Design a protein around this ligand. Structure first.
Ligand SMILES: Nc1ncnc2c1ncn2[C@@H]1O[C@H](COP(=O)(O)OP(=O)(O)OP(=O)(O)O)[C@@H](O)[C@H]1O
Ligand SMILES: Nc1ncnc2c1ncn2[C@@H]1O[C@H](COP(=O)(O)OP(=O)(O)OP(=O)(O)O)[C@@H](O)[C@H]1O
Ligand SMILES: Nc1ncnc2c1ncn2[C@@H]1O[C@H](COP(=O)(O)OP(=O)(O)OP(=O)(O)O)[C@@H](O)[C@H]1O
Ligand SMILES: Nc1ncnc2c1ncn2[C@@H]1O[C@H](COP(=O)(O)OP(=O)(O)OP(=O)(O)O)[C@@H](O)[C@H]1O
Ligand SMILES: Nc1ncnc2c1ncn2[C@@H]1O[C@H](COP(=O)(O)OP(=O)(O)OP(=O)(O)O)[C@@H](O)[C@H]1O
Ligand SMILES: [Mg+2]
Ligand SMILES: [Mg+2]
Ligand SMILES: [Mg+2]
Ligand SMILES: [Mg+2]
Ligand SMILES: [Mg+2]
Lengths: 147, 351, 354, 260, 51, 123, 278, 179
């Protein structure tokens, strides 16, 4: 986790002399209680970048399009506060949990997922925004999301 | 008294200066008197109506009133939505019935229900029959449905109101219903007139019973259209053209035999039609006198008109790709492969 | 012209007049002080003209106020909404019951609710019942729900409010529910009156438990209407005819017998009903040769009233296609078959109130 | 002092346009409606019905025709900084890149070689393939090289809370694209709104399907699209509507298969 | 009026024409107090709990 | 009539946010306290002395109306009070734009010179 | 100036002529509902001191809920007809007005008018129009209704134990009601108006038929014993339809055959259940 | 919350109170701004009993309170009918620091509840509340409280001022057996 969220900021020369951009995204997966959120807490403790924490269940909204809108707005704030680290904790909770308040069913969640696909790697140029995701159920994620 | 009349008219002009405040007449009372509602959401009572005869006013009539004393100065034309006024075509597309291949029966079924009643109205009165009300054109994509609508507008002098299904779907409740009843109102005032609602399934989706949520707004807009096609007031002076891809999605009340009398099916172009279609779209194209359109038609099974047109368009790409100034049969043959959009495969071990 | 001068001079006097604000009296504070509210605006403490009666200014009375002083100028009758005015002054089309076939039983039930109670009230008082005040015309599309309403509006000598639920919906805040109040206020003030609400499922649908803000406003319009059909204030000499081809989607409260007492089923025509409708529409058709209407009826199974009219239209279309001035049985034979193919595109029609 | 403020209003109806006293009915947003006449500094033929105008606060006479109203969200959807990706950064997609350029880049760059032969070049390309195959990378290369206006649209951006918004945003998207001589619209992840129509009893995806129907109408409908060449990218082309996957809307189907 | 007393979410009086802040009005109901007024959870103490 | 043509490319605001503005002093290298850093810092100091002397001379003979405190005092007069908060809808020209007040009414107004034109984007 | 409290009210009380003609005897088979309404509305109005002496906190509001046609609105008519207190009948949909602020303004006008003329009863039929639990902050409809509902909660909260006003709300979709309205002090008495039972059906049948000229040959127990789950409006319709069949045959006495035809017509119950399930 | 002077915030998820929480309303953690301003605070959610929104709100609030919240003294409580329906995320050790069971009051606890609520009525001397507690097997505190309220109703029905033992017994039969 240091080489993707800490080393690029503290020691960017190592990457530049090697001619590689740092690893773009990182996901922490494992059984519950294994230390996934704890490592992000350690990352947030020793970081000079703005830390934004969002739980995957927060991306399920009550109205159509606000799910994609919130993901779009979350990564806009990250771009303003560059460099930034975006921690999408419990990312699998967007799909593994179904709520009646979410007007659109699995279809609106898929649109929210596609919006997150654009933000992680899409048409828009991305600044110094590092993405950390945590999940205890990585088999339920869309493989295109963690590609 | 002639000088006094002219001098009085001069004082009339000073008060009748622009701007006017647009208002709608609400009521006409006796104790000769009118109640108007201004566009500023204000209701006023006029002891005297103004410079308009009381007999020429009716409730709901649009009037232009004085900005200060709010007396009616003149009557305004009936108001239609700018969106409704913007969907009436004035360019009159330059298509033709000869630019459509393999739809002679479909064209005849449409012309004789839409153009024939307007021009030769005597064949219906003499026969004692009512002309067909509404024509629905349904079929697979690219079969030439919108194309025939352009040809109908091309070869008809009647007012044509092009329209799409999503255009009648709006935020505010009743906004779509107003647009539908404004399009038919505007079409009535410019009779004879034709209304073409492309992609009917946007508003014509079947109604359903649900307990939690539903698209009740769009069904309200459709229900308004169900009135306009055949409702309390029989509108037999406006012709309606409807086009959709999925007739199975449409509400049964919309496919009624009083709203859409003729439901013309647009089939996949056959071998003869496909050769005709490629010939149609190769007219403005320098094509060598050796292309076998019969062979190309045999190579385009399960092709619609759009794919047949794309074959000619793609064949021009290949001629430009290799620099040739004339399109050959091989360019058409290899252009079929691109339109076919077959996935890349290493199936060289076959046979 | 002497008359031209009089009209020109009348305009000059008319130009000097100024419009008056329309309001509503709320309460008379003193003999010379009133509380009035603007139609769309604030409430004011205003005075009144000495020459005015001041006894006709009961609370709720519509008044005209001076623009500057807001003094009450006159008392006006209850305002007739222009939409409600268009409802009453809507031409049905001079439709007679002789233009409706196969609905003789259904016509009688409709005329038993809106005709007899308004002409012979004492007939039902003697038995000891209050006659039904609302009826629902439901059935498959094209069966004759709107045609029956037009016929009963054209023939019955009574005030008739003709409106469709989709034309009452307004985007403004509470406007749609306000229209229902004005609709019934007009009916209450113009007794006997009949309100016909075609396509009632536009606003009469089932109340959503998790709907949108747009849905909630439509439901408020519905339960405003529900409060007028059967609420605290009893409806007298006002009858409601409601038509829908999807009564399954209607709210249970709207379908309740206290509001829609009768549910008249305008069903698809049967063998005799199909025969009657055919003669109605094939009547004015010019034809030579024997016309076997029975043969058309056998192939017309599942058709509605509009389909049988289409058979007559398409039969003439085959004559016009063949350059004929007359329609033969063969032309009818193709027409009934051609329409039959078109019925394969229609989804389920059998919908009934729950 | 010299330049007075002007209220934005929309012209509704022109009364007596033939005569020398043409009266214009205007809709001043939420303020009111007025019947006004043109100013002396504006030609009678420069104001048409249904167009936005600027009117004064005293007599509300039309003073300047105005551009049509466009959603600020739709305006931001146009690309203003070109990406740092060129076609030299895409490997293994040689044949794919030539097909993409010859539809979306060559006709704008060298239009003279198509009009002479009476050629109507395709106005749409669909890029499909598994994730990471280079669909958006090639589109980013297109925007860097293109000189016409490039608009980036993400299918999730066309999903909106209220009914008719996604269709509306598509309408204003093509309305703003038509105000330019040549334009490019990129629809990244079209499958968000481009799914095939279906009837599941309830209103399943009815609103989103209308957004796709409006997009389909603009691509190939009664009215000509214009000089817009659209570019669609999706990793799930099997879910797209058949009418959207049809020539005249998506003429070229460039497949970004796994590199050899 | 001191600028330091102008606290966010405070009620102030502004002049008719200039809209000048000329008086700090008494503070409105706190949003949490307003929120807890509609929730109206019954107040309780340990004396009214048995067992 | 012809539509006004903007001189600014695009309709978005400048990407750079929160810079040092006029205080973007150069990165003098190296940071070690040696002669050329002293020499480099002196050159920065010298031009400031030149800048300070030049600016003072101009303002000394500038008209009493045109002064740094007077122009700023004037700026408030052109702005006036109160300052209504609106929403930018479209940038018609460099000095012209469509704005909408909180009441939902749009106005075609003129953008004054003292406004930061690089911060203007629709919405 | 300060206007009198009874002044400035768009909503008026029920006059003597506006009192409904429905009596308690006109309602059949709602003894439980009548007692609960009486013990919570009309008895506290006349016996407030007896409540304080015993220690009962009188319920400020009463919510009447149940399937449509089960005597909700009619009991309110009976209460208004049989009350010595002022009655303020209003509809929930009436509060939603185009003029922003006029909605909440007339909510407090009703409670001010009731407070000034205490004892008083506020009956708000169809409460779902202003008491829906879902609100959209970007829509003027939900923003205004939220203001109306918040004022309604505030008005009921501002009524102490001394002010002798009873509020009655009626609804057939109480599942859509905001839970804040049912909190203690606002609506502490939820009275359910269910479908009539077999004993309730016979009392309902007897009351409506008592006003009709029947024949001795009709046996109401034949239709009471039917297992159909029908409401009071349904039973009224059966009697109402029985009388019209007699009218159709030019008869002023309802025969047993009319009731059999009327019951079949009104109920018109599709089976909706297949025998193989039991 | 009343005894520790901690602000009591009830989070029902109601959209009626959403204007007070904030105009954004996109995520439930926006209430933390009002919670920090009134620290110490107790955030309470009751599950009336798709997936549970109250339990979902638990996770969002508990995750923030784990190590990402600077201000201390912000406690959070959930009230649920059953503990075996909870999500595994909430049941994970370290998430909920203490689970407190509220069993239905027994014979002695019902007497204490009966004593508490009957103090708000005009009671005749000599009421054997112990017998009344025995007459309510397997009842909750709300049912015991409702029995007292119904007991006062029976005094009103007989136009009496003081509640007698018969009234409590008639109230027990109505609340428990009839309902
Ligand atoms: N490897 C570890 N070393 C030290 N402490 C640990 C370790 N793993 C877990 N913990 C402790 O467990 C506590 C709770 O676990 P934590 O929140 O990190 O879980 P997680 O792995 O993110 O799982 P999940 O979100 O699926 O429940 C942490 O606050 C930390 O103190
Ligand atoms: N039968 C045909 N003859 C000639 N051209 C045809 C034919 N069918 C399709 N085309 C061509 O296909 C193109 C698109 O046709 P059109 O827009 O009418 O399709 P459509 O069937 O209405 O599509 P959709 O239902 O998907 O909207 C046009 O360029 C038209 O010339
Ligand atoms: N019984 C009938 N006799 C004669 N014509 C009929 C009959 N029923 C329907 N029609 C004909 O059907 C056409 C449409 O009928 P109508 O407008 O009454 O439809 P509807 O039953 O109200 O249908 P929808 O459910 O779509 O509103 C008319 O031309 C009318 O003449
Ligand atoms: N052909 C290629 N040549 C060079 N680099 C490539 C190629 N294809 C992909 N990449 C690299 O892989 C990354 C994957 O992002 P890209 O936008 O190309 O994916 P995509 O095909 O749009 O995927 P998705 O379907 O998930 O949207 C690119 O940013 C680029 O760095
Ligand atoms: N117990 C009863 N005895 C006699 N008639 C009854 C009874 N209950 C209901 N009714 C009948 O119910 C009809 C009106 O129903 P009412 O308005 O009282 O019901 P509601 O529950 O308020 O209705 P909704 O929920 O649809 O608004 C009257 O015609 C009346 O005769
Ligand atoms: Mg965790
Ligand atoms: Mg088409
Ligand atoms: Mg009809
Ligand atoms: Mg991509
Ligand atoms: Mg009722």
């Amino acid at each position: 986790i240091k080489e993707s969220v800490e080393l690029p900021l503290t020691h960017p020369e190592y990457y530049e002399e090697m001619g590689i951009k740092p690893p773009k995204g990182v996901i922490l997966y494992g059984p519950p209680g294994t230390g996934k959120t704890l490592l992000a807490k350690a990352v947030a403790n020793q970081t000079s970048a703005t830390f934004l924490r969002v739980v995957g269940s927060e991306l399920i909204q009550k109205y159509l399009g606000d799910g994609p809108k919130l993901v779009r707005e979350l990564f806009r704030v990250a771009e303003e506060h560059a460099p930034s680290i975006v921690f999408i904790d419990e990312i699998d909770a967007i799909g593994t949990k179904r709520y009646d308040s979410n007007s659109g069913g699995e279809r609106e969640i898929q649109r929210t997922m596609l919006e997150l696909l654009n933000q992680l790697d899409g048409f828009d140029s991305r600044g110094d925004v590092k993405v950390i995701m945590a999940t205890n159920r990585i088999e339920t994620l869309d493989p295109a999301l963690i590609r | 008294m002639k000088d006094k009349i002219k001098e009085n008219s001069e004082k009339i002009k000073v008060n009748k200066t622009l701007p006017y405040l647009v208002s709608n007449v609400i009521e006409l009372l006796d104790v000769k008197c009118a109640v108007i509602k201004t566009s500023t959401r204000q209701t006023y009572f006029l002891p005297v109506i103004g410079l308009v005869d009381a007999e020429k006013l009716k409730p709901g009539d649009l009037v232009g009133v004085n900005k200060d004393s709010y007396l009616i100065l003149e009557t305004l034309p009936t108001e239609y939505d700018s969106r409704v006024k913007a969907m009436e075509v004035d360019e009159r597309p330059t298509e033709q019935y000869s630019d459509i291949g393999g739809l002679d029966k479909q064209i005849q079924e449409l012309v004789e229900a839409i153009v024939l009643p307007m021009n030769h109205k005597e064949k219906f009165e003499n026969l004692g029959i009512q002309p067909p009300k509404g024509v629905l054109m349904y079929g697979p994509p690219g079969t030439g449905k919108t194309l025939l609508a352009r040809a109908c507008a091309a070869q008809t002098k009647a007012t044509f109101l092009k329209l799409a299904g999503p255009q009648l779907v709006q935020m505010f409740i009743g906004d779509g219903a107003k647009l539908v009843r404004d399009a038919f109102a505007l079409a009535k005032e410019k009779a004879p007139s034709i209304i073409f609602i492309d992609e009917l399934d946007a508003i014509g989706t079947k109604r359903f019973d649900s307990e939690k949520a539903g698209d009740r707004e769009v069904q309200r807009t459709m229900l308004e259209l169900l009135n306009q096609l055949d409702g309390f007031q029989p509108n037999t002076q406006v012709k309606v053209i409807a086009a959709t891809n999925r007739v199975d999605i449409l509400d049964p009340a919309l496919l009624r035999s009083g709203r859409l009398d003729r439901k013309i099916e647009f089939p996949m172009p056959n071998e003869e039609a496909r050769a005709r279609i490629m010939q149609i779209h190769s007219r403005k194209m320098n094509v060598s006198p050796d292309v076998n359109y019969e062979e190309l038609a045999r190579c385009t099974d399960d092709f619609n008109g759009a794919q047949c047109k794309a074959v000619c368009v793609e064949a021009g790409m290949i001629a430009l790709r290799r620099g040739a100034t004339e399109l050959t049969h091989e360019d058409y043959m290899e252009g079929i492969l691109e339109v076919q959009a077959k996935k890349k495969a290493n199936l060289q071990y076959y046979a | 012209l002497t008359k031209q001068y009089e009209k020109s001079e009348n305009d000059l006097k008319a130009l000097q007049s100024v419009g008056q604000i329309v309001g509503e009296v709320l309460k008379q504070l003193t003999e010379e002080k009133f509380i009035v509210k603007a139609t769309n605006g604030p409430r004011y403490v205003v005075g009144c003209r000495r020459q005015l009666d001041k006894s006709k200014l009961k609370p709720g009375t519509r008044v005209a106020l001076d623009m500057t002083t807001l003094t009450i100028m006159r008392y006006l009758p209850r305002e007739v909404d222009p939409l409600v005015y268009n409802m009453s002054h809507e031409d049905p089309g001079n439709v007679s019951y002789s233009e409706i076939g196969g609905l003789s039983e259904q016509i009688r039930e409709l005329r038993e609710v809106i005709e007899l109670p308004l002409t012979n009230p004492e007939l039902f008082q003697r038995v000891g019942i209050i006659p039904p005040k609302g009826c629902l015309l439901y059935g498959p599309p094209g069966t004759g729900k709107t045609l029956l309403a037009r016929a009963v509006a054209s023939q019955l000598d009574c005030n008739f409010l003709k409106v469709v639920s989709s034309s009452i919906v307004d985007k403004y805040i509470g406007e749609s529910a306000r229209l229902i109040r004005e609709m019934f206020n007009y009916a209450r003030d113009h007794q006997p009156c009949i309100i016909f609400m075609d396509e009632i499922d536009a606003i009469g649908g089932r109340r959503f438990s998790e709907g949108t803000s747009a849905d909630r406003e439509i439901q408020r319009t519905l339960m405003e209407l529900l409060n007028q059909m059967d609420g605290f204030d009893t409806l007298h000499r006002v009858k409601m005819i409601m038509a829908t081809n999807r009564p399954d989607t209607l709210d249970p409260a709207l379908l309740r017998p206290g509001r829609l007492d009768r549910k008249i089923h305008i069903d698809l025509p049967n063998e005799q009903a199909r025969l009657d409708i055919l003669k109605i529409h094939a009547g004015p058709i010019t034809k030579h040769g024997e016309i076997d209407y029975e043969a058309i009826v056998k192939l017309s199974d599942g058709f509605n009233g509009a389909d049988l009219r289409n058979v007559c239209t398409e039969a003439g279309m085959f004559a016009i296609r063949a350059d004929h001035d007359f329609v033969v049985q063969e032309d009818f034979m193709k027409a009934v078959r051609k329409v039959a193919d078109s019925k394969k595109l229609e989804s389920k029609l059998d919908y009934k109130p729950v | 002092q010299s330049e007075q403020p002007l209220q934005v209003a929309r012209c509704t109806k022109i009364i007596n346009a033939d005569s020398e006293d043409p009266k214009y009915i205007i809709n001043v947003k939420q303020f009111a409606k007025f019947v006004v006449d043109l100013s002396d500094q504006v030609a009678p033929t420069d104001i048409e019905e249904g167009m936005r105008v600027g009117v004064d606060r005293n007599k509300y006479q039309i003073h300047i025709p105005l551009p049509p109203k466009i959603d600020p969200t739709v305006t931001m959807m146009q690309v203003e900084e070109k990406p740092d990706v060129t076609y030299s950064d895409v490997g293994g997609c040689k044949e794919q890149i030539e097909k993409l350029r010859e539809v979306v880049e060559t006709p704008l760059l060298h239009p003279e070689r198509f009009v002479n032969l009476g050629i109507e070049p395709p106005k749409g390309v669909l890029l499909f393939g598994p994730p990471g195959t280079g669909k958006t990378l090639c589109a980013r290369a297109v925007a860097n090289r293109t000189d016409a206006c490039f608009i980036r649209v993400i299918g999730s951006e066309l999903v909106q809370k209220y009914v008719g918004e996604g269709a509306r945003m598509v309408r204003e998207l093509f309305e703003m694209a038509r105000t330019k001589k040549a334009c490019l619209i990129f629809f990244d992840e079209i499958d968000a709104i481009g799914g095939a129509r279906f009837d599941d009893g309830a209103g399943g995806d009815n609103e989103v399907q209308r957004t796709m129907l409006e997009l389909i109408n603009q691509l190939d409908g009664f009215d000509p699209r214009g000089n817009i060449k659209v570019l669609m990218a999706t990793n799930r082309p099997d879910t797209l509507d058949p009418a959207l996957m049809r020539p005249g809307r998506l003429d070229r189907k460039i497949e970004f298969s796994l590199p050899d | 009026i001191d600028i330091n007393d102008v606290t966010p979410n405070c009620r102030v009086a502004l002049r008719n024409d200039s809209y000048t802040l000329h008086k700090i009005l008494p503070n409105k109901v706190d949003p949490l107090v307003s929120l807890m007024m509609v929730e109206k959870v019954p107040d309780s103490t340990y004396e009214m709990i048995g067992g | 009539y012809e539509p006004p043509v903007p001189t600014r490319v695009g309709k978005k605001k400048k990407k750079t946010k929160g810079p040092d503005a006029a205080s973007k002093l150069p990165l003098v290298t190296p940071h070690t306290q040696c002669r050329l850093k002293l020499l480099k810092l002196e050159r920065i100091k010298d031009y400031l002395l030149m800048e300070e002397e030049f600016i003072r001379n101009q303002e000394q003979m500038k008209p009493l109306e045109e002064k740094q405190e007077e122009e700023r005092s004037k700026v408030d007069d052109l702005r006036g009070t109160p300052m209504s908060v609106g929403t930018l809808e479209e940038i018609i020209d460099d000095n012209h734009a469509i704005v909408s007040t909180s009441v939902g009414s749009e106005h075609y107004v003129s953008i004054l010179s003292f406004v930061d034109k690089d911060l203007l984007e629709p919405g | 100036d300060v206007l009198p409290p009874e002044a400035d009210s768009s909503i008026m009380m029920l006059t003597s002529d506006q009192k409904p003609d429905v009596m308690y005897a006109d309602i059949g088979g709602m003894d439980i509902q009548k007692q609960e309404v009486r013990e919570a509305v009309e008895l506290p109005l006349t016996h407030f001191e007896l409540y304080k002496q015993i220690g009962i906190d009188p319920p400020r509001g009463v919510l009447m809920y149940g399937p449509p046609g089960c005597g909700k609105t009619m009991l309110a008519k009976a209460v208004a007809h049989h009350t010595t207190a002022a009655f303020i009948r209003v509809v929930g949909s009436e509060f939603v007005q185009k003029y922003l602020g006029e909605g909440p303004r007339m909510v407090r006008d009703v409670f001010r008018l009731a407070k000034e003329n205490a004892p008083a009863i506020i009956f708000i039929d169809e409460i779902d129009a202003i008491a829906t639990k879902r609100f959209d902050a970007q829509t003027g409809a939900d923003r205004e209704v939220q203001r109306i509902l918040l004022e309604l909660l505030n008005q009921m909260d501002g009524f102490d134990q001394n002010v002798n006003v009873k509020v009655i709300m009626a609804t057939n979709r109480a599942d859509t009601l905001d839970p804040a309205l049912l909190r203690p002090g606002r609506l502490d008495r939820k009275i359910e108006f269910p479908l009539p039972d077999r004993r309730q059906k016979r009392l309902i049948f007897s009351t409506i038929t008592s006003k009709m000229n029947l024949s001795e040959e009709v046996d109401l127990e034949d239709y009471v014993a039917r297992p159909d789950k029908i409401s009071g409006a349904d039973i009224n319709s059966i009697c109402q339809e029985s009388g019209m069949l007699a009218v159709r045959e030019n008869r002023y006495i309802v025969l047993a055959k009319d009731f059999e035809k009327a019951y079949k017509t009104v109920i018109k119950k599709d089976e909706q259940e297949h025998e193989f399930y039991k | 919350a009343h005894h520790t002077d901690c602000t009591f915030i009830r989070v029902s998820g109601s959209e009626l109170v959403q204007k007070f929480i904030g105009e954004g309303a996109r995520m439930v953690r926006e209430l933390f701004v009002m919670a920090r301003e009134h620290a110490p605070s107790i955030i309470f959610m009751d599950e009336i009993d798709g997936d549970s929104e109250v339990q979902r709100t638990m996770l969002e609030l508990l995750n923030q309170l784990d190590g990402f919240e600077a201000t201390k003294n912000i406690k959070v409580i959930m009230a649920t009918n059953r503990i075996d329906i909870l999500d595994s995320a909430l049941l994970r050790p370290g998430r909920i620091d203490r689970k407190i069971e509220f069993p239905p009051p027994n014979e002695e606890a019902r007497l204490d509840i009966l004593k508490i609520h009957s103090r708000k009525m005009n009671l005749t001397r000599g009421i054997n509340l112990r017998k009344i507690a025995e007459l309510m097997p397997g009842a909750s505190g709300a049912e015991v409280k409702g029995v007292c309220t119904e007991a006062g109703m029976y005094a009103l029905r007989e136009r009496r001022v003081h509640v007698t033992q018969e009234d409590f017994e008639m109230a027990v039969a109505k609340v428990m057996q009839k309902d």
